[PDB]
Each structure stands twice: as C-alpha cells, then as structure tokens.
Paper text:
Envelope glycoprotein (Env) trimers derived from the BG505 genotype are the basis of many current HIV vaccine development efforts. When expressed as ectodomain constructs stabilized with SOSIP mutations, trimers based on this clade A sequence can be readily produced at high yields while preserving the native-like, pre-fusion conformation targeted by known broadly neutralizing antibodies (bnAbs). Herein, we introduce cryoelectron microscopy-based polyclonal epitope mapping (cryoEMPEM): a method for rapid, high-resolution structural characterization of antibody-antigen complexes without the need for mAb isolation. Twenty-one high-resolution maps of trimer immune complexes with polyclonal Fabs provided detailed insights to the nature of antibody responses at eight unique epitope clusters predominantly targeted in BG505 SOSIP immunogens.
To explore the effects of nanoparticle presentation of BG505 SOSIP trimers on the epitope specificities of vaccine-elicited antibodies, we used the computationally designed tetrahedral nanoparticle scaffold T33-3154,55. This nanoparticle consists of four copies each of two complementary trimeric components, referred to as T33-31A and T33-31B. Analysis using cryoEM showed that nanoparticles assembled as expected with eight flexibly linked trimer antigens on their surface (top row). Consistent with the structural data, biolayer interferometry (BLI) experiments demonstrated that the antibody binding profiles of BG505 SOSIP fused to each nanoparticle were equivalent to those of free trimers. However, reduced binding to antibodies targeting epitopes in the middle/lower part of the trimer such as the fusion peptide (PGT151, VRC34, and ACS202), gp120–gp41 interface (35O22), gp41–gp41 interface (3BC315), and the trimer base (RM19R and RM20A3) was observed in the context of the assembled nanoparticles. This is likely caused by the crowding of trimer antigens on the nanoparticle surface, limiting the accessibility of epitopes near or at the trimer base; an observation consistent with previously reported data using other nanoparticle scaffolds. While nanoparticle display did not improve the overall levels of NAb responses, it had a dramatic effect on the epitopes targeted and angles of approach of elicited antibodies, particularly after early immunizations. Interestingly, our analyses revealed that presentation on the nanoparticle failed to eliminate base-directed antibody responses, suggesting that this epitope is still readily accessible on the nanoparticle or becomes accessible upon nanoparticle disassembly in vivo.
Numbering used by the authors:
A (entry chain F), D (entry chain N), F (entry chain J): 1 to 104
B (entry chain E), C (entry chain X), E (entry chain G), G (entry chain M), H (entry chain V), I (entry chain Q), ...: 1 to 118
Write the structure that this text describes.
C-alpha cells in the first residue's frame, strides 16, 4: 500500500511541535506521535556522546516522503537530520484508508 | 475601527511542554479561523493565562511557532479558585476590527467547553 | 474612536464567595456609571486581578450576573508585595470611546481609596 | 518467519492495560510494551488537533493478526483504531521461537 | 487610529525596592523614547508583570514617578516556568496609534535581551 | 541498503546504558535511543505477568547484526534477550551514509 | 459456608497508572487462581490498600478490567511505617467458602515475597 | 446464609460536621432501604472511608444517630488519587444474607453517581 | 454460621514500637477472651487501624507474636478528625460465629473507654 | 610520582537515571582520554559531586560500567548557591602521576563550559 | 610511595550519637586492620560522608577517640538518591603506601555489605 | 614525596558574598603561609566544605582571586549536626610534600578556634 512510519529525532519540544504541526498541517502526514524523554547515545566526531532528544513517529506514505524529507530538513536544526522510514506490512483497513485520504 | 477582545480556552491532560505547546497552537489557530483573521497585523496584543498546575512551558512560545513574531505577547498566572477546571490555558486577544461585539466568536476546546458563557 | 482604560478597585473583609461577588458587582457597576456607560457593547475587554488572599471565587463570574455575557473577561493573580492592602479586587476595563484620557473617571471603593492615584 | 511488531495507539492507561492484557492472555500476543506520555498531533475532520495517548508495542505474528484486529476493535473506544504492523527482518533466534510458542 | 501593543523587559540583580523602581523607570522611558511617545495621553493602559522572585515593590509605582498619573496601570504575577530568566520585569503598553505593527519598537534591557523575539 | 532499527528491551537504566554504550563504542551501532518508563505485560511460564523495562532503539546495519546479537547476549541479564530488527525502507541519504560510516 | 479472607500483595517499581493497574490485575488473578475461584459470585467484598507513595491510580479500577463489576470494592491508604517495603499494593478478599482456614492460599509477588508470613 | 457487601457513596459540598453527618445518614438509610434491611441485626460490620478533604467529623458517629449501636463500625482514610471526585464518603456494609450477588443494590448519591459501576 | 464483627480499641502513651506491639497484644487477647474464642480458625480476617500519630510499628506484627499466622491481617490509617482521641489502635475482627449480634462483646482499654458506644 | 587532581564537569537536561549515568560515563572517559590514562591503576580515588537537583541516580554507579571496580569512589552533594549552573555533575580524580600541574588537562562539557577556569 | 584510597562503609539502626560514634570506630579500626596499618602517620587524610538521615553526631569525632589527632578529617553530606541504603556512614581514607591498587582491602559492615563492589 | 592534608577553618558572621570570599582568602593564605608554601604547584587539590547556612557564594571562587587557577577545586556541603558551630568554612588541601605528618600546621580562625583538635 506504501504506508510508512517515519522516525524523526528532535532536540526539543519546540522543534518537535513545530515539525509535527507543519507536517500534519501541510498534509505530509496524517498523524504524528511525540515520544518525550529520550536519552541519546551516539557517535559524534571521534567519540561517544550523549544528548536528550524526543522522538516523532510520523504516519505518512511513501509518495509523500520526498516532500517530507525536504520540509523536515528546512525546519530541523541539524546538518544531518535523522529521518528514517519503516514500512507497514499490514494494518486496520479503515485506518490505512484514512492515512491515504489525509496525506497528499 | 475599534477593539474587540477574542477569548478562548483549552485544557490539557498533563504538564508536558509538548502538550502545552500543541494545545496552545490548536487554540490560537482555531480562534483566528473562527473570526476570519488572515493576518496577525490586526492583533494589538495577546494575553495568555494559565492555571497554577501548568508550569513546564510558556504558551507564548507556541505563538511564535505559528509566526506571531510581531504580536506583543504577555502572560500571567491565574487565581487558584478551588473547584476550578484544572490545567487550563486561556487566551485573550485584542483585535483591531470593526466587527460588532456580538459577532466575535469565542473558542472553547476540550474540557473548557464546560466554562463557555452560554 | 480610541481606547481608554478604566480602573477601579474595591476591598472586601473576608474571602467568602458572596462577598467577592457582591463587591465585584458594586465596583463594576460603579465604574460604568461613573463614565456614563449604558451598554457593554463599548467594552473591548475586562481584566480582573486579585490579591493572593482571595481564592474562594472568581470576580469574573459576577460580571455575568450583571449581564456582561459578551464582554471578554480575563483574570489574573497579583504580586504579593509585603505591606500592600489585603483582600483587594482590581479591575481594568478597556473602553472603546472618544473620551479624552483625563475625562475618564476611576473608581476606588472601601479601603481601596487609600491607593487612589491622587 | 512472519513475526511482527504492532503499534496500537490508545487514549488512556485503562485502555492500554485492558487491551494489552487481553491480547497476551488470549495468546494473540506474546508480549506488549506500553509507552506512556505521548503527545499526539493529528488531522481530525477539517483541522489539526492534539490529544494525549499511549503507545502499545505488540509482539505478535502475522497469522494472528486478523484475530488481533478484531479483538482490538472490540475493546478500543474508536471508530477507527490505529493498528499497524511493522515486519521483523531478523532477530534473536530464541526470542523469535519464543514468540511463536506463545502466540496462537 | 488603532491599537498597538508595545513590549519590553528588563532584569534586575536583586529584589530591592530601589532597584525595581529604578529599573522600571529605565524601561518605561526607553520604550516611550523608542516609539517617539511624547505624551502619556496616547496610552490606553499599561500592564506590568513580574517574576515570582520580585516581591519588594510594585513596578506600577515607578510609573507615577515619571508622571503617568492618568494612565491606567495594572499588574500581575508571571508563570514560574523552570529555567526561565529570573528577576524579570515585563511591560505591555497599549498605544493608541496609527503606527503599523511592524514599525513598533520593542525594548529589551540587561539580561532580557536574550529573550528578545529576533 | 541494509540499514536497520533494532529494538532491545532492558530491565534497568544501568543495563540500558551499559549496552547502549558498548554498542556505540564498539561500532556495532551508530546511535542508540533509550526510551524510559515502559510497562511490560508478557506471558511468562504459565501466566501473564508484568515488569518495568526500558526500550533501546539501535540504529545499526544488518551486517553488524550477528555481532550485536552476541554482544548483547553477553551483557543482557536474561536467558532470552528480546532483540528484534525492523528494516528501514528509506531515509535521509546523509543520515544513512552516516550510519554506515560509523558502523563496522 | 463461612467466610475466609484471602490475602496477597504485589510491588511496583514506579507510580505510573499503567503499572498500578497491571500489577493489580496480576495479583488479583493470581489470588483467584491459587484458590480455585472460577467466579466472582463467591466474593463478598474486596479491600485494597496501598502505601503512601502510590497515588496515580486506584487499584480498584483494575478489578473492573477483569470483570469484577458486581464485587463491592473498597480502598484505603496504609500506615507509613519507616522501613516498610515501598510501593506496595495489598489486597484482602472476603471469600464465601467452606474451605478451612489453613487451606486458603495467599499470594505474594515481586518484592512482597519478603513480607510473606512464613 | 452468606455474606454480601453493600456499597454506596455520597458527596458533600463542604467539610462541615453537620453536612457530614447529614450526608452519612442519608446514605446509610438509603442503602438499607434499597436492600430491604429492616434490622441492623443482619449487619456484620460497616466500614466507612473518606477522602482526604473531609476531616471535621467521623461518619461513624452518624450511624449511632440512626440506632446502629451494636453494629461494629470501622473507618479509614482514602487514597488521594489526583482527579478523583472530592469530598466523598464511601460505605461498605457486610450483610449476612442469602441474597445473590447480583440482587444486592448499591447506592450512589449526589455527585457520586458519576462513579457508579454501570 | 454467620459473621459478626468484633470491635475494640486501646490507647498508648507514645509511638514506641514496643508500646504498640504490647498494646496490640493486650487488646487482641482481651477481645478473644471476651468472646470465648479459643482458636483463630474462627476468624475470617482482622483489620487494624491506627491514628495518624502512630507510625513506628505495624499492629499486625503483634498478631503473629500470639500465633495468628493464618489469619488474614490488613491495616489502614484513620481519618485525623481534630479533637479525636490521640494514639489509638482500633481493631475490627470478623468472626465466623452463630453468636447473636447483641451477644458479641467489644473491648475498650485505657483511654479508649471514653469512646465506647454505651 | 606525586598526586595531581583532575577536574571536570558535565551538565544534563533532566534528572533521569539514564541521563545521569550516560553523562557520567561521557565525562569520565573524556577526562581519562585527555590525560592519556590507559589504566585505572593510576587513580588513587574519584570524588563525585552533584547539584541539589540531581537525585535519581548515583554517578559513581556509572564508573563501574566502564570498569573502575577497584577505584575508590566517593560522592557528595554540592552547595546550592543561587544563580549557579543547574544539573551539574562534577568530578575530581586523584591521579598518581609525575605530570606537572600545568600539564594536567581538565574537562568541561555541555553547559559546564561556562564555568571552566579560563 | 604513592596514594591509594581505602573505602568502607557501615550502617546503623538509629540516629543516636552513641551509635554513630560506635559504628564509626568499628569501621575505622576494621579498615586499618584489613590493610595492616599500624600507624596513622601513613594517612594523608580521611573523608567521611553520611546519608541525610544521620544528623546527631559527626563521625569525625570518633576518629579522635581512637587517636587520629593529627590526621586531617573532613566530612560531607551524601546525595539522597531514593531507594538507597539508609543510615550509612562511608569513609574514604587516603593512604600513602606502595601497595598496588588491587591489594588494598575495602570494608563493608552490617547492611553495607549489599553495596560492596563485588 | 608523599601527600599530607592541610586543614583549616574560619567562621563568618553573615551569609554575604563579600564576607565569604574575604574569609576564604584569609584562611587560604594563612594555611599556605603556615606551612611555607610559596607555590600552588605543590597542591594536588583543594576541597572546601561549608555549613548549611552559607549559600550566597562559593569559597572556591576566592581561590582564583589569589591565583590558584590550576589547582583543582572541589566543594561540598556539610552535615547539619545540631549544636555545631554555625557559618563555618572548612578547607582540606592536599599537599605534595615530604613534610612529616606532625610537622604540618593547621589553621583555625575566628570562632573556629574552638573546634581545633588540641
């Protein structure tokens, strides 16, 4: 069907809301879930560092993904935003129809 | 033109910055849509107030996420009257319009509908 | 027309809902009479503030007992400066008038007269 | 192998527990993780609104999915429950064997 | 004419009445100069808010030291969001002007510059 | 491309950090997100029980997965660790290049 | 028949509504299984008590998730004796059985096993 | 015979001894009428619980105003879960009857009706 | 048989674990003697409650010093009504007997005699 | 050889055990790398201190995740000077080296850089 | 020679000066015996820390009862992490020895054994 | 060389930043003079502790006014034992010397002389 869940990692609530709102408002997403309170350990430059972060789960479709990537890059305060899409294998039919109706 | 205040309110379930900001955006945009406001140039000022139980974020910050960069924003804390509806964000906007007082629409969302003056 | 604020204040002896509401009515009506306001259509908004020791009721509720159903009403809690006059209800109304600033009358009742800017 | 992770979004802890318990008890799932505290921004009717929500991560299999969908629809207080399955590409072998043993 | 709010803020280092009053004067006069206001007749009202840590004086008193005797003055206490800038005095003035929204200047002094919406 | 998100469930913050740090430090992962505060309902032996748990989201690749599984088994205090990989369908190109540069 | 109380206890790691409800379900179902109770018709009442540190949810709510809709449910707060096991949910059920006192099984889960009367 | 618990609840508007006692009487008598109890001889015990905000009187005292002099009366304080219904008096009575569990009526009065398990 | 509650109470002079345990034993044994109970097999359950000022020990522990190992024991904290008798331990036992309600004896010791329902 | 202390500090955004442990690891490893320490055998002791707002975990625990099992670890709480940088973890390590005092590197991370003695 | 820290800990049952002093002596002497220290001349310093619940005495005083009159003694209060072992006295001694790090023995007494790094 | 701690203490009359800093300087310089320390290169570290009543400044800041820029400085809060000398600043310095333990001089100033170990 092409429905996807996109994971976007953001540094703060302002960013999380700003992006989540823009994606839904602009129909690049039907639904965005914000998961607060993450602890992030990652490699940076030559070492391992930590950060805070929040996670956005964006329920979108593959055809809108190229637009999403550009819009997120414009809003997200990083050189390299962490944007990855995981595929949906199957799901509630009405829900999936709904995502398509509200996306694009 | 003259000045008409626009009021609205929204409730949240928890004192989480994301919830506050998201709720504030929903309310501000809904107020503006209800009254047909296509530009922030018509707003003299916006005053936000919150109940004593919401301290993790300032609603005024949300206003700048929707572009109200030039709208004066002020905020204050509400009187803790026992029995009042908890976790409430209230907004008063001052609108430079020629709209009659009784043609200005007010917005009450979520549990704030119970406090609507109807 | 332009906008002029109208101020006034009243004190109460105790934090009893009836006293708060009654005092609020007395003050609001007196402010409106002082300035000749025969209609609430001229009010852009009313902002009420109270001292930290009055928490049993919201003054804004009184406003709807005298019919200000369409007047935007906002309220906030005051700064607890030591030595200040206790149990004070203050009101700022924004009036859409052509009245000069120095022709707007302000109302101070009960012990609030001591804080009148004269 | 057909192992899947199902994302179910629920409005409250009572619902989250009620569903999670029913799915595990009835062997429609081997394991359910509840992630509290979400902020949800989504399109509703003609506008963008927010809600609270919790997220359930259900470790199940594809063959039990049709049953899961029906059971969740019965318990979940929405016209359109948000139920989506993400596939598992690979994993700990003992764990995956375990999920199959406990599901169905 | 219409109404435009004017905002500004200033910080102080301690909760000393003299510091509060002095800071309030500096901010009010600077706001008025920035916008070319030569008379208080143009001000509909002024609303002052302060953070939870400034309780020794009322900023509104300073306003009468610079002659704003007829300008309605209201004050309120701010929401104590953790991490906010401490000891901040904020002012919203409502100005009866024909100045476009984007031609109104706002004033941020001392450490309040970090919270300027730029 | 072979990029994957691995879900590892851990019982405590000490374990979560110990594993997350080891995987990133050893280049078995480029980034690990820790999601605290989970409630876990699962079948154990003959009944349904609950636990606390935290969730690790590990951004890694499929070729390093076999090593990850062994390292996690060594660190994780369970007979059967819950380690499952979900595939990435697509994503930010710079990000995906970054994961590969930092993994292996 | 006569009446025998059934006791049990479970601990949780945090005061999260989901944890409380989940733990309560685990304990109630385990108590009923231990004693062979296939119906809630045999329960006269269930009394839940909790320690002072669990205030986010009522364990009694969990009871209705497993269908005990007609079983009277009462709850109370426990005595905060220093040194006691934290975050404990305790349940006393009154069972209308003919089971001898020493044939009634009690259930202690998680860290509550340390307080089992053995 | 066997034992069936009887539950009910009532709310009051204020923590005034007269209100507590009056409310307690109303609830106890209503519970007894609902279940046809013409004598206190059938009651094994009555347990009263109250919310944290009612401390001016003991509901158990009311029970002796309606003659339950020989009925064992115990009382306890409830768990203060945020968001719960305030000022609630809850009663669990243990009734030595042969009435089936589903034929026992429970009583919820005033605002306690919202918490009825229906 | 049926179920009859047995009540009693005892006071202590200080919140010392030894005093609490000793007092609890005295009261439990006296209740059992008063009613002729030679075995704990007849007790469905025992519920202990204490006032807010006794937190150094759990009365339920005393019950196991006198051998009530198989009797379900539950405890709860009492409502702090001002003016109440301080440092009171109250016990409700549920007894599976055929004794008429008015033939069950209740025990009040030390200063608890003043609260006896006579 | 002689003894040189090594200092460093790191800040965290919230009092979450995972954040504390992760931050502590980052800081300890960075200090050791900065000074070329390839073995914990050179450390006489490590002392950790934290600000008053970090109570969910002990930084010393992190030290054992990176293998400092034989390094004596002590911790203490810092003086709450108003205006200080919040949520700070500070570490003093005592290093048995022959390194000159001015060749020992110190590490300040995140917002702790503002307190670096430069 | 070099410097090695020596650690140990002991718990007490109550905050009684005698218990604190006695426990401190037991721990200090045991640490010194474990490592073969026959003289206080080898100790550079001793740092004592205690949990938040021990305030009736200073452990450092005990050190002078066993003759450590010339050993610098410093003390500090520990971080109150919830769930930590209560009533704990911890000691770090800095020993001017040539003993390898892994040949230094550490001492954990009473309930402090559960926190031993093994 | 080896390591010897140097101790001293000073009291202040009030919690004023100037007093704290001035007192800290006096004490640090006096300690260094007493022991003939002409360079900070000999100090491995300095640990400052203060009583619970001194929170307006960090003594460690004073150390940088006298040039100890490269000396690791750590600080902690002291245990509030009732009856202790109030407003006390204590310092432990770790000195990389060959001075015998009994040849190291300690400094007690102002009211701290009463706590000198003599």
């Amino acid at each position: 069907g092409g429905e996807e869940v996109v994971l976007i990692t953001v540094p703060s609530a302002l960013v999380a809301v700003k992006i989540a709102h823009a994606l839904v408002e602009e129909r690049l997403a039907a639904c965005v879930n914000i998961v607060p309170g993450l602890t992030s350990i990652y490699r940076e430059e030559g070492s391992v560092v930590s950060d805070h972060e929040l996670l956005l789960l964006v329920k979108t479709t593959t055809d809108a993904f190229p637009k999403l990537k550009e819009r997120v890059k414009e809003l997200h305060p990083y050189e390299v935003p962490e944007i990855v899409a995981l595929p949906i294998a199957e799901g509630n039919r009405e829900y999936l129809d709904w995502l398509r109706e509200n996306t694009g | 033109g003259s000045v008409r205040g626009i009021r609205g309110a929204i409730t949240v379930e928890e004192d989480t910055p994301a919830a506050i900001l998201a709720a504030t955006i929903e309310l501000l945009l809904k107020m503006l849509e209800a009254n047909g406001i296509q530009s922030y140039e018509e707003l003299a000022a916006v005053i936000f107030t919150v109940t004593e139980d919401l301290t993790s974020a300032f609603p005024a910050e949300a206003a700048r996420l929707i572009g109200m960069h030039r709208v004066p924003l002020l905020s204050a804390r509400e009187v803790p009257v026992p029995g009042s509806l908890p976790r409430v964000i209230r907004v008063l906007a001052l609108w430079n319009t020629d709209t009659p007082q009784d043609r200005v629409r007010h917005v009450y969302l979520n549990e704030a509908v119970r406090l609507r003056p109807d």
